[PDB]
Design a protein around this ligand. Structure first.
Ligand code: 8RW
Length: 217
């Protein structure tokens, strides 16, 4: 997250860190007791999910690491596009839920968020153009753009005036009104440049797919 602030500890209990070899790789969102949503290019070693965290490195009683039983990328995802860039991760067991570990409701109704609404994006992605990697969860509020400025019907954008998502925030949540609306996409892009908006996968466009996969337990 560029141009953001340290989040309050455990105040976004849906957050997840998607980890490779013990190292944060992508954001993710707990969307059911046993399922985390993230981005497709995250899956392309050992993939694990860390829930209940604020610090990546410091002891916290709420922190628990999970193995992944099944990874379900979107079947139309491809490694060279940011279309269909969703990934569902089934945890090896149901997560122990509590105030620090809670699923977030996600948008099933296919309507755009009102342009200019401020939504919250969180993550442990880089925090400056030197690639400084934060130990504690970051977040920022960002205004949603109209579709015509963003240019599909399956993507939304947000302003990128120095405040923005960036590398390592991929897969993480864009939240409005307490509901997941977007998932940070996982393609490379210039960050922080007002002419080059942040891009996020519109979760409401994928309602049937998500429901399907979650139906499969
Ligand atoms: N939407 C955005 O603006 N972006 C999304 C990006 N894609 C990723 O981010 N990833 C691809 C999959 C794994 C992942 C990744 O590289 N993860 C990664 C790799 C090394 C270190 C790392 O941790 C930390 F973020 F802290 F650096 C994460 C990205 C890259 C550069 C610039 C903008 C970017």
């Amino acid at each position: 997250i560029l141009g953001g602030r340290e989040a309050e500890a455990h105040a976004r209990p849906y957050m997840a860190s998607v980890q490779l070899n013990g190292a944060h790789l992508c954001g993710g969102v707990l969307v059911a007791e046993q399922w985390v949503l993230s981005a497709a290019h995250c899956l392309e070693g050992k993939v694990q999910v860390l829930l209940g965290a604020h610090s990546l490195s410091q002891p916290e009683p709420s922190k628990r690491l999970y193995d992944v039983l099944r990874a379900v990328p979107h079947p139309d995802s491809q490694p060279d596009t940011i279309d269909h860039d969703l990934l569902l991760l089934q945890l090896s067991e149901k997560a122990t839920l509590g105030p620090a570990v809670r699923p977030l409701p996600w948008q099933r109704v296919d309507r755009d968020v009102a342009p200019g609404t401020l939504c919250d994006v969180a993550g442990w992605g880089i925090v400056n153009h030197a690639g400084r990697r934060p130990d504690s969860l970051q977040h920022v509020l960002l205004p949603v753009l109209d579709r015509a400025t963003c240019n599909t019907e399956r993507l939304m954008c947000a302003e990128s005036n120095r405040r923005d998502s960036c590398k390592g925030d991929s897969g993480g949540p864009l939240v409005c009104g307490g509901v997941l609306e977007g998932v940070v996409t996982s393609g490379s892009r210039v960050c922080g440049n007002r002419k080059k908006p942040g891009i996020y996968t519109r979760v409401a466009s994928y309602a049937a797919w998500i429901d399907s996969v979650l139906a499969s337990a």
